[PDB]
Write an enzyme that holds these catalytic residues in place. Structure first.
Site, PDB file in Angstrom:
ATOM      1  N   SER A  11      50.405  29.772  48.978  1.00 38.44           N
ATOM      2  CA  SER A  11      51.836  29.860  49.137  1.00 38.44           C
ATOM      3  C   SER A  11      52.289  30.933  50.151  1.00 38.44           C
ATOM      4  CB  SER A  11      52.459  30.127  47.786  1.00 38.44           C
ATOM      5  OG  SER A  11      52.137  31.429  47.379  1.00 38.44           O
ATOM      6  N   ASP A  35      45.390  37.081  43.852  1.00 36.66           N
ATOM      7  CA  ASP A  35      45.263  36.675  45.261  1.00 36.66           C
ATOM      8  C   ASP A  35      44.582  37.792  46.065  1.00 36.66           C
ATOM      9  OD1 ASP A  35      46.714  34.389  44.366  1.00 36.66           O
ATOM     10  OD2 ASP A  35      48.652  35.304  44.776  1.00 36.66           O
TER      11      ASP A  35
HETATM   12  N1  LIG Z   1      48.314  46.512  34.807  1.00 37.31           N
HETATM   13  C1  LIG Z   1      47.773  45.643  35.639  1.00 37.31           C
HETATM   14  N2  LIG Z   1      48.341  44.420  35.891  1.00 37.31           N
HETATM   15  C2  LIG Z   1      47.793  43.515  36.759  1.00 37.31           C
HETATM   16  N3  LIG Z   1      46.644  43.782  37.411  1.00 37.31           N
HETATM   17  C3  LIG Z   1      46.021  44.943  37.236  1.00 37.31           C
HETATM   18  C4  LIG Z   1      46.541  45.980  36.325  1.00 37.31           C
HETATM   19  N4  LIG Z   1      45.721  47.037  36.344  1.00 37.31           N
HETATM   20  C5  LIG Z   1      44.727  46.702  37.225  1.00 37.31           C
HETATM   21  N5  LIG Z   1      44.926  45.428  37.751  1.00 37.31           N
HETATM   22  C6  LIG Z   1      44.064  44.694  38.752  1.00 37.31           C
HETATM   23  O1  LIG Z   1      44.422  43.327  39.057  1.00 37.31           O
HETATM   24  C7  LIG Z   1      43.162  42.585  39.174  1.00 37.31           C
HETATM   25  C8  LIG Z   1      43.310  41.078  38.962  1.00 37.31           C
HETATM   26  O2  LIG Z   1      44.025  40.820  37.739  1.00 37.31           O
HETATM   27  P1  LIG Z   1      45.219  39.744  37.624  1.00 37.31           P
HETATM   28  O3  LIG Z   1      46.364  40.093  38.502  1.00 37.31           O
HETATM   29  O4  LIG Z   1      45.505  39.553  36.158  1.00 37.31           O
HETATM   30  O5  LIG Z   1      44.496  38.433  38.210  1.00 37.31           O
HETATM   31  P2  LIG Z   1      43.821  37.293  37.271  1.00 37.31           P
HETATM   32  O6  LIG Z   1      44.812  36.996  36.179  1.00 37.31           O
HETATM   33  O7  LIG Z   1      42.505  37.893  36.907  1.00 37.31           O
HETATM   34  N6  LIG Z   1      43.537  35.885  38.283  1.00 37.31           N
HETATM   35  P3  LIG Z   1      44.886  34.863  38.827  1.00 37.31           P
HETATM   36  O8  LIG Z   1      44.859  33.685  37.801  1.00 37.31           O
HETATM   37  O9  LIG Z   1      44.616  34.487  40.357  1.00 37.31           O
HETATM   38  O10 LIG Z   1      46.211  35.674  38.691  1.00 37.31           O
HETATM   39  C9  LIG Z   1      42.284  43.215  38.112  1.00 37.31           C
HETATM   40  O11 LIG Z   1      40.878  43.056  38.351  1.00 37.31           O
HETATM   41  C10 LIG Z   1      42.654  44.668  38.231  1.00 37.31           C
HETATM   42  O12 LIG Z   1      41.923  45.242  39.287  1.00 37.31           O
END
Ligand SMILES: Nc1ncnc2c1ncn2[C@@H]1O[C@H](COP(=O)(O)OP(=O)(O)NP(=O)(O)O)[C@@H](O)[C@H]1O
Ligand SMILES: [Mg+2]
Length: 303
Positions: free
Chosen positions: A8, A226
């Site tokens: 996107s 992403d």
């Molecule tokens: N509080 C937080 N919220 C979101 N991400 C975090 C936080 N703290 C650390 N992260 C980082 O964000 C990375 C990816 O997490 P996230 O944003 O949940 O992607 P996902 O859910 O694993 N995959 P997707 O389905 O593409 O969103 C993690 O490996 C962390 O490094």
């Protein structure tokens, strides 16, 4: 090396190609962005407006590239997609780029849903799952599902570190040589305020398996998955037989970007108040220096 990234685009904000382009550009990649939609902003806002790209239009752009003999890429990067039709067209394009270049690395982010509390909930029409299981994953060389997505793609439920690593064995055998669970419920010996990343790589057959325990921050970000996928592409490129270091550089980049975002978001919303989605947009541009050369702030456990 050249990268075709199909995700996107938003005008204000940092999700999909917005979150993946600048960072990969900073790191010296010749990235070409196919905007699978163009919205005013991400869907976490109260409002959004824009247009989508249909699969006939995707094929048009690809023909454009083929006619000029430009359809030769070192990587393909895909992420969040709403249409099964669009996804199937993405599959055909990768099939062909892989025939055009058999050394092509396909990085797939199998975006399906997430565990928004304890129960997981799908973000995507249900019919996309089979296309992913049967068509997309068998083609991918690198996948980056969260825990929920790993469970869906495998059939199995994941409740322990050992279930997680067996599910990663399943996904390995579906095709991809690098599997990285990007976030999970799993418990950490260091606290409740943690989030577990698991990584698995098959190489010349040897296995490398890693774990990372990551201090949660109390906020919901958009585009971080992403960003994870894009940085893993960048860092496994530079360290191709070192999943440990590649993951440490990926996650450290994420720390620095988020750190800056939360510090900035708190300042914008005032001491006390919880920030809006607007104030929580990745401060991407400002993180330029940390993307070029991230300071390692997490060590990976070898497994
Ligand atoms: N509080 C937080 N919220 C979101 N991400 C975090 C936080 N703290 C650390 N992260 C980082 O964000 C990375 C990816 O997490 P996230 O944003 O949940 O992607 P996902 O859910 O694993 N995959 P997707 O389905 O593409 O969103 C993690 O490996 C962390 O490094
Ligand atoms: Mg998530």
């Amino acid at each position: 090396s050249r990268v075709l990234s199909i995700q996107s685009h938003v005008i204000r904000g940092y999700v999909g190609n917005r979150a993946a382009t600048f960072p990969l550009q900073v790191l010296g990649f010749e990235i070409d962005a196919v905007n699978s939609v163009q919205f005013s902003n991400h869907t976490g806002y109260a409002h959004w407006k824009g247009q989508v790209l249909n699969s006939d239009e995707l094929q048009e752009l690809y023909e454009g590239l083929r006619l000029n003999n430009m359809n030769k890429y070192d990587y393909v990067l895909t992420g969040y997609t709403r249409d099964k039709s669009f996804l199937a067209m993405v599959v055909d394009i990768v099939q062909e780029l892989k025939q055009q270049n058999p050394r092509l690395v396909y990085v797939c982010d199998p975006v399906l849903g997430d565990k928004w509390d304890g129960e997981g909930s799908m973000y995507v029409p249900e019919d996309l799952l089979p296309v992913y299981k049967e068509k997309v994953v068998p083609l991918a060389d690198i996948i980056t599902p969260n825990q929920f997505e790993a469970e869906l793609l495998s059939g199995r439920k994941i409740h322990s570190q050992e279930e997680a690593l067996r599910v990663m064995d399943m996904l390995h055998s579906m095709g991809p040589d690098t599997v990285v669970i990007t976030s999970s419920d799993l418990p950490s010996p260091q606290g409740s305020n943690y989030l577990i990343v698991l990584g698995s790589q098959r190489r010349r057959v040897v296995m490398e398996r890693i774990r990372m325990d990551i201090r949660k921050v109390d906020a919901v970000f958009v585009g971080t998955g992403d960003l994870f996928a894009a940085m893993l592409l960048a860092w496994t490129h530079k360290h191709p037989n070192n999943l440990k270091v590649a993951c440490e550089k990926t996650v450290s980049t994420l720390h620095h970007v988020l750190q800056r975002t939360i510090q900035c978001a708190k300042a914008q919303a005032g001491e006390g108040v919880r920030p809006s989605p607007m104030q929580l947009e990745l401060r991407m541009v400002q993180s330029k220096r940390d993307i070029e050369d991230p300071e390692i702030v997490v060590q990976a456990t070898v497994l």
